[PDB]
Amino acid sequence: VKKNIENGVAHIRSTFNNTIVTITDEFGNALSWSSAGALGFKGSKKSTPFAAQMASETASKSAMEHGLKTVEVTVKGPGPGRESAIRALQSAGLEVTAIRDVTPVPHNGCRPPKRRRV
Amino acid sequence: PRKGSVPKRDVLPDPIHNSKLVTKLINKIMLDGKRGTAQRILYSAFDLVEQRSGRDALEVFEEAINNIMPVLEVKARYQVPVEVRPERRTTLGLRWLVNYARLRGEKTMEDRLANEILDAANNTGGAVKKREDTHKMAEANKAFAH
Amino acid sequence: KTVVRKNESLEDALRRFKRSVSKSGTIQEVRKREFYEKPSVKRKKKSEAARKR
RNA sequence: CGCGGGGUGGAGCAGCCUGGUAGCUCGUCGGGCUCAUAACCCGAAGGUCGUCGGUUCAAAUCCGGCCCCCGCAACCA
RNA sequence: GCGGGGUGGAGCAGCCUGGUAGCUCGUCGGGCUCAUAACCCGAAGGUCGUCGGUUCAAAUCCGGCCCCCGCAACCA
RNA sequence: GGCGACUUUCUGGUCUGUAACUGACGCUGAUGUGCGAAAGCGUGGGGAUCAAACAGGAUUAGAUACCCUGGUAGUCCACGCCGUAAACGAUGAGUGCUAAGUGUUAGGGGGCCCCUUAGUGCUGCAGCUAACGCAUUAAGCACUCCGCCUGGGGAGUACGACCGCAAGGUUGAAACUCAAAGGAAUUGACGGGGACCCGCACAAGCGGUGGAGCAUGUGGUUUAAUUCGAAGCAACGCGA
RNA sequence: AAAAUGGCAA
Ligand SMILES: [Mg+2]
Ligand SMILES: [Mg+2]
Ligand SMILES: [Mg+2]
Ligand SMILES: [Mg+2]
Ligand SMILES: [Mg+2]
Ligand SMILES: [Mg+2]
Ligand SMILES: [Mg+2]
């Protein structure tokens, strides 16, 4: 009934609209996840680093129940909450083995959406 | 559009209690420059609170103000929770005390004030509630603290 | 991949990570390709950037 | 005529099952903020749970009675 | 020939099921603005087509009259 | 016009050096003849992304927009068609001449430096220019040739022709009407432009006005007459 | 975020 994975990878996805944190095992199966919206942060608040911190904390606490003691941080997107989220993971007590940035960069691939004229 | 800060005025210690805060509280109670009425109200209120409390009037006053004064407040810039200035904190405490005393339904102002300070020491005072309300909104805007 | 050093602060490792990301310039690249710009405009911006350098 | 299901702030919707501990969400109502508007934030009010009995330390909760409502059988005077 | 409707200046509810006139706009007074518009605040205005009937009581039901509208007006 | 992963095949042009050869064989270029962004068009194919149109949501007095969520043609390929773009260096082509300083690309020559050739930038004389500016990459000084202009609007319209599947393209008036259209630069003013600064401007506070009654001024209305003047701030307990 | 308009002469 209870998972027992000591080592996992935490994926933090930071966007200007929202920040999402998911803790997964090394295999990549999700153990727990939390978001600013899930914690009830709305609108501008979701972007704020505090919201990201809280999201990281909530996800980490669940991960500790799964028995995760060491976690690897994977960062995606340019959202401001990324910095707080990484600190919050360690503040929760999950060991951060490593930090990596996985934000996707196309080698001149598909066309982007139009620029907003306002 | 302002050159800079202006030096603040100072108050003489209240003769009865040798406390600056007592002098400041008198001034807030005073209306139309009628000092005598304000002093009369505060001293009478202090005697009443002391009698009912069974503790030193200055002691309960200290406890009351401590409960009323707020650590954090929100100022629009969005509302951002900011540390209240120590001098500002005293101002807010005394201001709320007198204002809430006026809101109270006791016939005489001295009775109102004495009840408020006693209730403020109890932490059941309406001025203390104002502090609580100020703290609630500060916690709500914690994300906007930055 | 930046790995947190033994007996090192997580914040220190995060700082090192931030520096490594800055060296990569991956974030910068992502921001450039957030919105489409006309092909001529790209060349103009590139030329302006060269003039800035 | 049977079988099955349900009745809870103005309303919807849990706890019922696995008794003690009516929650949640809108509609409200007053404030704060917004130039503002909206949104958001803060405080306050409104169901004693369909009803009536029994049991029990304690029942919206369980067991019974009763009523209303719903769905399905019954649908060849 | 058979149905439907006629409610503030306008458009539209209330009628089924008698006692209860609503909404949006316009209007009038104030505010805002250099001024106007927009916006904001407050207020007024409908004998319910018209004559009758019934009823304690009629926008509400019932019977005429007038206006308006829809449909039908066929077979040799 | 354009051309940005790599590989191979086919293929054009250019530049340096040398001075084998030829021996003015050059230059421009009406009419022609080709090529020509994007959009569009035809036929066949393909369809990830993006996205005219179109549809919700929002915004707004309205919102046939801006923003959001979707989304068709199109965007892609082949073969035709179209033949236009602020197709711009708003600068036709060939040639020679006329200060310099400096960067870079592909060479050549001689001792990191110097010299030199063809490009590609910046700076800057003489000279030019209405001015801004240009200045060996002339908008300087000269010669050849071609294209083009002669106030604004009507109007790139009408008619005719030609061309195109169509959309349209090319060519291209007049009646009428005006006394001006314009280029550059200057001084102000202004900006939902910027920087630096002030003032109870705001903020932080305290006490009011707007509600009641009354006093007074004014508007309006009234009257035989309600005397005249003041009219946003800067008329309205103002002349009084 | 929204954010319209203002007789011709002098
Ligand atoms: Mg107006
Ligand atoms: Mg095309
Ligand atoms: Mg779109
Ligand atoms: Mg042309
Ligand atoms: Mg050169
Ligand atoms: Mg008044
Ligand atoms: Mg004008």
XYZ file of C-alpha atoms (C1' of nucleotides) and ligand atoms in Angstrom:
727
model
C 0.000 0.000 0.000
C 2.988 2.287 0.695
C 5.717 2.986 -1.865
C 9.342 2.749 -0.691
C 11.618 4.572 -3.141
C 14.514 6.411 -1.471
C 15.854 8.127 -4.610
C 13.666 10.172 -6.977
C 13.654 13.064 -9.455
C 11.590 16.205 -8.808
C 10.444 18.016 -11.957
C 9.744 21.727 -11.436
C 7.975 23.404 -14.366
C 7.894 27.199 -14.030
C 5.675 29.339 -16.276
C 4.615 32.986 -15.924
C 1.013 31.791 -15.578
C 1.742 28.982 -13.086
C 4.415 26.810 -11.438
C 3.980 23.016 -11.218
C 6.180 20.665 -9.167
C 6.048 16.869 -9.490
C 8.152 14.359 -7.546
C 8.834 11.116 -9.427
C 10.953 8.001 -8.884
C 14.173 7.508 -10.873
C 12.119 5.439 -13.337
C 9.944 8.530 -13.855
C 6.699 7.222 -12.326
C 5.050 10.079 -10.418
C 4.923 9.755 -6.625
C 3.333 13.144 -5.893
C 2.732 16.574 -7.438
C 1.562 20.019 -6.307
C 0.771 23.335 -8.011
C 0.120 26.964 -7.056
C -3.433 26.626 -8.394
C -3.860 23.419 -6.371
C -2.814 25.281 -3.205
C -5.388 27.967 -4.064
C -3.042 30.638 -5.446
C -4.814 32.452 -8.293
C -3.986 34.969 -11.027
C -0.751 36.875 -10.361
C -0.072 34.873 -7.183
C 0.578 31.607 -9.063
C 3.700 33.096 -10.680
C 4.985 34.517 -7.384
C 7.963 32.607 -5.846
C 6.088 32.131 -2.558
C 3.440 30.107 -4.413
C 6.172 27.983 -6.023
C 7.827 27.470 -2.623
C 4.512 26.304 -1.148
C 3.916 23.997 -4.131
C 7.366 22.436 -3.671
C 6.741 21.967 0.061
C 3.375 20.241 -0.431
C 4.764 17.905 -3.110
C 7.863 17.155 -1.009
C 5.821 16.248 2.087
C 3.834 13.670 0.104
C 7.095 12.352 -1.385
C 8.518 11.851 2.123
C 5.465 9.675 2.854
C 6.461 7.625 -0.208
C 9.836 7.413 1.565
C 11.845 9.601 -0.832
C 14.913 10.900 1.021
C 17.010 12.116 -1.937
C 15.598 14.024 -4.917
C 16.996 15.465 -8.163
C 15.697 18.839 -9.359
C 14.774 19.235 -13.033
C 13.812 22.767 -14.096
C 11.731 23.716 -17.149
C 10.413 27.082 -18.359
C 11.389 30.694 -17.421
C 8.910 31.178 -14.560
C 10.242 33.214 -11.571
C 9.189 30.640 -8.955
C 11.930 28.171 -9.981
C 14.512 29.552 -7.518
C 12.199 29.354 -4.484
C 10.968 25.875 -5.460
C 14.480 24.383 -5.387
C 15.156 25.909 -1.953
C 11.755 24.732 -0.674
C 12.575 21.130 -1.642
C 15.679 21.201 0.571
C 13.719 23.108 3.238
C 11.202 20.240 3.207
C 14.227 18.040 3.959
C 14.529 16.153 0.655
C 18.216 15.882 -0.277
C 18.977 17.542 -3.621
C 21.517 15.298 -5.367
C 21.654 17.469 -8.510
C 19.980 20.349 -10.375
C 19.492 20.458 -14.163
C 17.659 22.701 -16.643
C 15.598 20.776 -19.205
C 13.691 23.680 -20.798
C 13.226 22.740 -24.503
C 15.077 24.615 -27.256
C 14.107 23.843 -30.901
C 16.872 23.910 -33.520
C 14.762 26.240 -35.691
C 11.685 23.995 -35.766
C 7.994 24.933 -35.807
C 6.746 28.509 -36.201
C 5.934 30.357 -32.915
C 2.562 32.098 -32.240
C 2.082 35.731 -33.298
C 3.332 38.590 -31.129
C 0.609 40.259 -29.055
C -0.168 43.737 -30.419
C -1.317 45.258 -27.117
C 8.020 66.453 -4.697
C 9.259 66.677 -1.085
C 12.725 67.704 0.111
C 13.008 65.104 2.889
C 11.894 63.961 6.353
C 10.831 66.444 9.046
C 11.907 66.024 12.734
C 9.052 64.732 14.902
C 7.827 66.547 18.026
C 8.372 65.190 21.551
C 5.990 64.885 24.512
C 6.699 65.439 28.214
C 6.119 62.404 30.527
C 2.618 62.314 32.026
C 2.990 63.508 35.675
C 0.686 60.786 37.024
C 2.436 57.786 35.425
C 5.676 59.311 34.053
C 4.850 57.779 30.658
C 5.052 59.375 27.208
C 2.368 57.045 25.824
C -0.127 58.287 28.433
C 0.534 61.859 27.248
C 0.064 60.773 23.623
C -3.201 58.981 24.445
C -4.491 62.151 26.143
C -3.738 64.161 22.989
C -5.694 61.742 20.773
C -8.692 61.901 23.137
C -8.515 65.719 23.175
C -10.886 67.496 20.775
C -10.944 71.219 19.915
C -7.843 71.735 22.083
C -9.794 70.850 25.247
C -6.909 69.232 27.139
C -8.566 69.259 30.568
C -11.486 67.089 29.428
C -9.104 64.609 27.768
C -6.872 64.359 30.853
C -9.952 63.964 33.064
C -11.296 61.132 30.890
C -8.008 59.206 30.738
C -7.190 59.479 34.456
C -10.760 58.536 35.420
C -10.683 55.634 32.939
C -7.332 54.463 34.347
C -8.768 54.499 37.880
C -11.835 52.546 36.715
C -9.812 49.930 34.802
C -7.443 49.517 37.773
C -10.349 48.973 40.188
C -12.073 46.403 37.963
C -8.826 44.709 36.897
C -7.319 44.669 40.397
C -3.987 45.423 38.697
C -1.959 48.601 38.090
C -3.636 50.846 35.495
C -0.341 51.468 33.688
C 0.318 47.705 33.633
C -3.011 46.901 31.934
C -2.543 49.867 29.570
C 0.835 48.423 28.524
C -0.786 45.015 27.965
C -3.684 46.591 26.051
C -1.527 48.634 23.659
C 0.717 45.602 23.026
C -2.334 43.633 21.850
C -3.688 46.483 19.690
C -0.401 47.351 17.935
C 0.247 45.486 14.603
C 3.546 43.933 13.449
C 2.686 43.953 9.710
C 0.424 46.062 7.468
C -0.373 46.206 3.740
C 0.288 49.290 1.596
C -0.682 49.572 -2.084
C 2.217 50.134 -4.498
C -0.825 45.665 -5.200
C -1.061 45.675 -1.403
C 2.287 44.512 0.011
C 2.738 43.438 3.683
C 5.437 45.646 5.214
C 6.972 45.891 8.689
C 5.187 48.631 10.644
C 7.523 51.401 11.820
C 8.031 51.315 15.640
C 6.787 54.903 16.022
C 3.957 54.110 13.584
C 3.078 50.990 15.584
C 2.510 53.088 18.726
C 0.459 55.599 16.715
C -1.792 52.856 15.317
C -2.244 51.295 18.770
C -3.346 54.522 20.480
C -5.444 55.597 17.477
C -7.417 52.335 17.376
C -7.913 52.327 21.159
C -9.582 55.759 21.281
C -11.560 55.211 18.064
C -12.941 51.863 19.258
C -13.705 53.361 22.683
C -15.870 55.970 20.927
C -17.657 53.135 19.088
C -18.491 51.480 22.432
C -22.003 52.021 23.789
C -21.171 53.007 27.392
C -22.795 56.333 28.291
C -19.602 57.956 29.607
C -16.372 58.052 27.575
C -14.307 57.154 30.659
C -16.316 53.932 31.075
C -15.900 53.116 27.373
C -12.128 53.635 27.415
C -11.668 51.607 30.619
C -13.729 48.739 29.183
C -11.805 48.866 25.890
C -8.342 48.783 27.506
C -9.467 45.928 29.776
C -10.935 44.108 26.758
C -7.760 44.905 24.794
C -5.721 43.280 27.577
C -8.147 40.347 27.327
C -7.505 40.454 23.553
C -11.298 40.478 23.092
C -11.214 44.231 22.389
C -12.500 45.613 19.080
C -9.204 47.462 18.570
C -7.400 44.125 18.952
C -9.779 42.716 16.323
C -8.653 45.559 14.036
C -5.063 44.374 14.528
C -6.187 40.822 13.733
C -7.936 42.054 10.571
C -4.792 43.964 9.540
C -2.726 40.801 10.069
C -5.191 38.626 8.130
C -4.887 40.767 4.989
C -1.090 40.937 5.405
C -0.923 37.123 5.426
C -3.217 37.080 2.372
C -0.806 39.329 0.444
C 2.268 37.361 1.585
C 2.920 36.301 -2.022
C 3.029 40.012 -2.922
C 5.639 40.688 -0.214
C 8.477 40.055 -2.698
C 24.189 18.482 -15.402
C 25.159 20.414 -12.266
C 25.504 18.113 -9.243
C 25.329 19.453 -5.676
C 28.811 19.256 -4.136
C 29.389 17.247 -0.951
C 29.165 19.455 2.155
C 27.925 22.346 -0.008
C 24.875 24.579 0.471
C 21.930 23.799 -1.818
C 21.627 27.551 -2.442
C 25.326 27.638 -3.378
C 24.763 24.715 -5.771
C 21.683 26.529 -7.094
C 23.840 29.624 -7.648
C 26.337 27.445 -9.550
C 23.410 25.967 -11.499
C 22.142 29.482 -12.289
C 25.617 30.415 -13.573
C 25.708 27.248 -15.707
C 22.276 28.093 -17.154
C 23.522 31.631 -17.873
C 26.528 30.153 -19.701
C 24.221 27.877 -21.712
C 21.903 30.793 -22.526
C 19.042 28.291 -22.834
C 16.557 30.598 -21.073
C 17.540 33.423 -23.436
C 16.908 31.190 -26.462
C 13.472 30.168 -25.130
C 12.457 33.825 -24.667
C 13.507 34.645 -28.249
C 11.297 31.890 -29.709
C 8.276 32.680 -27.506
C 6.762 34.846 -30.263
C 7.283 34.751 -34.039
C 9.111 37.653 -35.679
C 9.302 38.376 -39.410
C 12.449 36.938 -41.118
C 13.670 40.416 -42.082
C 13.156 41.562 -38.474
C 15.332 38.692 -37.196
C 18.224 39.821 -39.406
C 17.741 43.446 -38.321
C 17.779 42.477 -34.627
C 20.844 40.283 -35.232
C 22.585 43.188 -36.989
C 21.561 45.560 -34.179
C 22.893 43.048 -31.632
C 26.192 42.919 -33.550
C 26.288 46.737 -33.496
C 25.618 46.607 -29.741
C 28.593 44.238 -29.376
C -49.702 -2.544 -7.327
C -44.352 -4.252 -6.139
C -38.996 -3.564 -6.427
C -35.008 0.029 -6.154
C -33.336 5.154 -4.756
C -33.532 9.820 -2.496
C -35.455 13.782 0.865
C -29.896 18.780 4.797
C -29.250 27.535 4.817
C -32.424 30.458 -1.075
C -30.521 26.217 -3.573
C -27.233 22.329 -4.624
C -24.044 19.065 -2.252
C -21.147 15.513 2.434
C -20.727 13.533 7.126
C -25.135 8.243 7.171
C -22.527 3.745 5.702
C -17.994 2.557 9.401
C -23.495 6.778 15.814
C -20.753 11.331 19.255
C -17.506 15.965 15.709
C -24.580 19.529 10.136
C -19.272 20.368 6.209
C -18.707 22.149 1.251
C -20.144 25.451 -3.030
C -22.890 29.266 -4.981
C -26.819 32.956 -3.790
C -26.228 36.607 0.233
C -25.047 40.957 3.321
C -21.286 44.492 5.305
C -16.067 46.049 4.746
C -11.042 46.573 2.272
C -8.919 47.367 -2.433
C -9.764 48.661 -7.372
C -9.685 56.281 -10.445
C -12.385 52.548 -11.083
C -15.433 47.999 -12.845
C -14.728 43.347 -12.210
C -11.841 40.133 -9.773
C -9.548 39.232 -5.326
C -9.307 39.695 -0.002
C -11.685 40.068 5.128
C -15.830 39.610 8.372
C -20.985 38.261 9.236
C -25.912 35.715 8.414
C -28.881 31.661 6.776
C -29.920 24.521 6.990
C -30.651 21.392 13.828
C -30.340 17.485 8.448
C -38.209 14.819 5.279
C -41.078 13.824 9.542
C -42.233 11.174 14.024
C -40.921 7.394 17.457
C -37.496 3.640 19.424
C -32.538 2.459 20.896
C -28.104 4.399 22.737
C -23.178 7.635 26.820
C -24.284 9.884 22.318
C -28.256 8.997 16.070
C -28.535 14.012 10.516
C -25.980 9.197 11.464
C -28.787 3.250 13.430
C -33.441 0.625 13.800
C -38.691 1.331 13.043
C -43.253 3.911 11.678
C -45.047 7.656 8.411
C -45.124 11.189 4.322
C -43.370 13.414 -0.083
C -40.671 12.753 -4.445
C -38.158 9.889 -8.322
C -36.996 5.657 -11.375
C -38.368 0.849 -12.980
C -41.692 -3.260 -13.299
C -47.397 -3.670 -13.600
C -49.094 -2.129 -17.577
C -55.131 -6.992 -23.196
C -61.710 -3.868 -17.953
C -63.923 31.444 -40.846
C -60.793 30.155 -36.706
C -56.662 31.597 -33.262
C -53.015 35.540 -30.722
C -52.083 40.256 -28.688
C -53.402 45.411 -26.994
C -49.084 46.923 -19.552
C -44.918 54.078 -17.904
C -42.286 57.754 -23.704
C -40.140 52.480 -26.165
C -39.411 47.314 -26.122
C -40.663 43.376 -23.037
C -42.586 40.363 -18.107
C -46.802 39.765 -14.635
C -52.459 36.931 -16.801
C -52.503 30.144 -16.854
C -53.687 30.119 -10.845
C -58.177 37.495 -8.613
C -55.702 40.629 -3.833
C -48.530 41.634 -5.535
C -47.282 46.222 -11.545
C -41.161 43.886 -12.824
C -36.882 44.543 -16.124
C -33.858 47.257 -19.832
C -33.922 51.948 -22.140
C -35.729 56.903 -22.139
C -36.998 61.075 -18.670
C -36.119 64.554 -14.482
C -32.645 66.512 -10.474
C -27.474 66.225 -8.729
C -22.104 64.807 -9.560
C -17.855 64.236 -12.715
C -15.468 67.290 -17.045
C -12.930 73.310 -19.800
C -17.391 71.345 -22.215
C -20.007 67.316 -24.250
C -20.268 61.788 -24.351
C -19.607 57.874 -21.273
C -19.886 56.903 -16.260
C -21.849 57.758 -11.130
C -25.946 59.047 -7.440
C -31.060 60.077 -6.401
C -36.119 60.360 -8.116
C -40.594 60.408 -11.120
C -43.823 58.316 -14.675
C -48.773 52.732 -16.773
C -56.847 54.621 -14.610
C -53.063 47.774 -17.618
C -57.223 49.196 -25.666
C -62.247 50.517 -24.613
C -67.375 49.759 -22.678
C -69.817 45.769 -19.735
C -70.350 41.513 -16.524
C -68.923 38.652 -12.262
C -66.665 38.992 -7.620
C -65.644 41.380 -0.971
C -61.879 42.318 -4.550
C -60.273 42.185 -11.611
C -53.952 43.745 -15.703
C -55.334 38.849 -13.989
C -61.714 35.643 -15.131
C -65.970 36.271 -18.303
C -69.034 39.188 -22.662
C -69.238 42.925 -26.333
C -66.669 47.071 -29.235
C -62.282 49.029 -31.734
C -57.287 48.366 -33.338
C -53.433 45.085 -34.724
C -51.460 40.195 -36.235
C -51.219 34.983 -37.940
C -53.621 31.026 -40.442
C -57.625 29.220 -43.557
C -60.682 30.663 -47.668
C -61.313 24.055 -50.997
C -64.214 20.490 -55.088
C -66.347 21.093 -59.383
C 14.179 38.751 -56.411
C 16.941 35.987 -52.972
C 20.356 32.212 -50.806
C 21.788 29.523 -43.542
C 21.842 21.289 -41.098
C 24.967 17.641 -43.501
C 26.401 14.560 -48.037
C 26.996 13.482 -53.169
C 26.051 14.578 -58.407
C 25.258 18.385 -62.146
C 26.206 23.561 -62.906
C 26.874 29.524 -63.247
C 29.572 33.673 -61.718
C 33.599 36.365 -59.375
C 38.513 37.775 -57.512
C 44.228 37.518 -57.104
C 48.856 36.498 -59.950
C 51.379 35.909 -64.653
C 51.804 38.232 -69.186
C 50.598 32.556 -73.658
C 47.696 34.434 -77.267
C 43.966 37.583 -79.923
C 44.237 42.768 -81.221
C 39.458 47.598 -79.995
C 36.758 42.266 -80.888
C 34.277 48.109 -76.565
C 30.010 50.990 -74.000
C 24.876 51.927 -73.702
C 20.673 49.855 -75.198
C 14.208 51.821 -78.157
C 11.481 47.672 -79.650
C 12.038 42.761 -77.987
C 13.254 38.438 -74.735
C 13.717 36.336 -69.833
C 13.913 36.354 -64.464
C 11.173 38.270 -60.634
C 9.235 38.666 -52.508
C 4.570 37.886 -50.633
C -0.367 37.269 -51.540
C -3.446 35.012 -55.144
C -5.059 31.337 -59.212
C -5.374 26.078 -61.780
C -4.349 20.641 -61.385
C -2.484 16.626 -58.479
C -0.393 15.583 -53.621
C 0.515 16.697 -48.383
C -1.033 18.858 -43.718
C 2.893 18.907 -38.028
C 3.141 24.510 -36.746
C 1.107 29.022 -37.596
C -3.195 31.251 -39.249
C -7.124 35.552 -43.462
C -12.180 34.091 -43.096
C -15.328 32.074 -39.528
C -17.089 30.822 -33.995
C -17.096 31.450 -28.863
C -14.945 34.538 -24.426
C -13.613 39.259 -22.988
C -13.246 44.580 -23.559
C -16.375 48.631 -24.737
C -21.405 53.466 -25.127
C -20.943 50.254 -29.317
C -16.133 46.498 -30.581
C -17.999 43.748 -37.370
C -11.019 45.241 -33.471
C -6.896 45.318 -30.286
C -6.431 40.493 -25.972
C -8.014 34.952 -25.032
C -9.555 29.832 -26.639
C -10.385 27.339 -31.289
C -10.073 27.371 -36.636
C -10.661 26.952 -42.874
C -8.103 28.432 -47.070
C -3.346 29.327 -47.099
C 1.326 28.288 -45.044
C 4.651 22.841 -47.644
C 5.832 19.808 -52.640
C 5.444 19.309 -58.172
C 4.019 21.483 -62.664
C 1.567 25.708 -64.911
C -0.405 30.957 -64.210
C -0.040 35.753 -62.255
C 4.135 39.884 -62.967
C 3.370 43.189 -58.679
C 6.013 45.250 -53.523
C 8.561 51.606 -49.257
C 10.922 45.151 -55.664
C 14.777 51.010 -51.490
C 20.792 52.829 -51.347
C 13.312 56.136 -52.674
C 20.591 56.978 -55.675
C 20.358 53.628 -64.181
C 24.709 51.706 -66.726
C 30.111 52.188 -68.584
C 34.610 54.932 -67.918
C 38.560 58.394 -65.834
C 39.956 61.912 -62.221
C 40.021 64.308 -57.173
C 42.973 64.663 -49.164
C 43.482 61.475 -45.549
C 42.398 57.979 -40.722
C 40.560 53.287 -39.317
C 37.883 47.969 -39.180
C 36.922 43.606 -41.716
C 36.513 39.452 -46.199
C 39.280 36.744 -50.396
C 44.001 37.197 -52.334
C 49.402 38.906 -54.115
C 54.437 40.801 -53.059
C 58.530 42.300 -49.653
C 60.763 42.983 -44.981
C 54.998 41.601 -36.334
C 55.415 45.655 -39.919
C 55.122 47.681 -44.871
C 53.178 47.647 -49.905
C 49.368 46.234 -53.214
C 44.393 44.135 -55.693
C 39.046 43.250 -55.563
C 35.104 43.702 -51.999
C 32.527 45.146 -47.525
C 31.856 49.285 -43.111
C 32.986 53.520 -40.098
C 35.213 58.582 -39.954
C 36.428 62.815 -42.572
C 38.923 67.088 -46.673
C 38.389 69.621 -51.259
C 34.089 70.134 -53.808
C 28.868 69.819 -53.909
C 23.867 70.775 -51.662
C 17.564 74.506 -50.274
C 19.006 72.198 -46.172
C 19.608 67.549 -44.189
C 23.617 65.512 -45.872
C 27.317 63.108 -49.835
C 32.453 62.757 -49.855
C 37.543 57.245 -54.128
C 31.241 52.397 -52.218
C 30.111 61.012 -54.503
C 25.038 63.268 -54.090
C 32.657 66.174 -56.217
C 34.801 67.065 -61.216
C 34.000 65.114 -66.577
C 32.361 62.063 -71.427
C 28.858 58.414 -73.872
C 24.059 55.998 -73.862
C 19.249 54.753 -71.992
C 14.777 55.579 -68.720
C 11.975 59.437 -66.417
C 9.743 64.562 -64.698
C 7.619 69.645 -65.685
C 1.521 72.720 -59.763
C -2.308 70.049 -56.600
C -6.850 67.335 -57.049
C -10.018 64.789 -60.421
C -6.858 59.954 -61.272
C -3.609 55.690 -61.937
C -9.817 57.112 -62.672
C -12.836 56.944 -67.685
C -12.694 55.233 -72.671
C -9.922 52.089 -76.218
C -6.302 48.318 -76.875
C -3.307 44.405 -75.264
C -2.424 40.617 -71.574
C -4.559 37.170 -67.567
C -8.562 31.258 -65.822
C -9.769 34.982 -62.603
C -7.981 38.549 -59.424
C -6.089 42.020 -62.066
C -1.666 44.055 -64.873
C 0.329 47.348 -68.764
C -0.822 51.755 -71.459
C -3.507 56.043 -69.953
C -7.087 61.199 -70.500
C -10.712 64.967 -70.107
C -14.637 68.127 -68.330
C -14.429 70.316 -63.819
C -11.895 72.650 -59.503
C -8.203 75.074 -56.316
C -3.986 78.901 -55.461
C -1.726 76.682 -53.672
C 0.450 70.734 -53.080
C 5.272 70.262 -51.471
C 11.251 69.521 -49.426
C 14.493 70.964 -45.513
C 15.285 73.504 -41.310
C 13.958 76.926 -37.071
C 11.134 78.883 -32.848
C 7.139 77.574 -29.787
C 3.163 74.609 -28.129
C 1.788 69.741 -27.296
C 2.403 64.112 -26.480
C -2.100 57.736 -22.997
C 7.429 60.581 -24.978
C 11.829 60.439 -21.668
C 15.279 62.331 -17.683
C 16.032 65.460 -13.432
C 13.208 68.436 -9.837
C 9.343 71.310 -6.791
C 4.055 72.826 -4.376
C -0.992 70.109 1.427
C -0.165 67.631 -5.659
C -0.539 62.994 -3.635
C 0.572 59.925 0.477
C 0.419 59.884 6.032
C -3.249 62.553 9.282
C -6.919 66.114 11.443
C -11.277 68.898 10.816
C -15.060 69.844 7.353
C -18.813 70.592 2.552
C -22.579 67.601 -0.039
C -27.968 65.595 4.107
C -31.528 69.492 8.283
C -33.049 74.486 9.571
C -31.543 79.243 8.917
C -28.243 83.714 6.723
C -26.411 85.587 2.284
C -24.951 85.647 -3.120
C -26.341 83.803 -7.797
C -29.407 81.187 -11.683
C -34.229 80.711 -13.016
C -39.169 82.117 -12.550
C -42.250 86.133 -11.205
C -43.201 91.524 -11.204
C -45.258 98.159 -12.693
C -40.335 97.662 -11.216
C -37.863 93.256 -9.002
C -31.416 98.831 -11.026
C -26.794 97.897 -13.249
C -22.034 95.320 -13.242
C -19.204 90.124 -12.100
C -19.786 84.261 -15.189
C -14.831 77.531 -15.209
C -10.070 77.798 -12.073
C -9.306 83.688 -11.923
C -18.587 85.423 -11.253
C -21.762 83.625 -7.361
C -21.219 86.831 2.050
C -18.134 89.681 -5.492
C -18.620 96.167 -6.815
C -21.793 97.123 -1.732
C -7.674 47.880 -18.220
C -10.506 51.675 -20.383
C -9.470 56.419 -22.137
C -14.773 59.513 -27.903
C -15.439 64.585 -29.363
C -14.928 70.058 -29.739
C -18.909 76.053 -35.918
C -15.689 79.161 -38.656
C -12.921 83.863 -38.459
C -9.555 86.616 -35.636
Mg -22.900 64.068 -19.169
Mg 3.023 32.170 -52.955
Mg -5.688 34.164 -33.166
Mg 6.101 50.002 -59.744
Mg 38.418 49.667 -50.161
Mg -26.436 71.834 3.746
Mg -11.805 73.286 -34.020
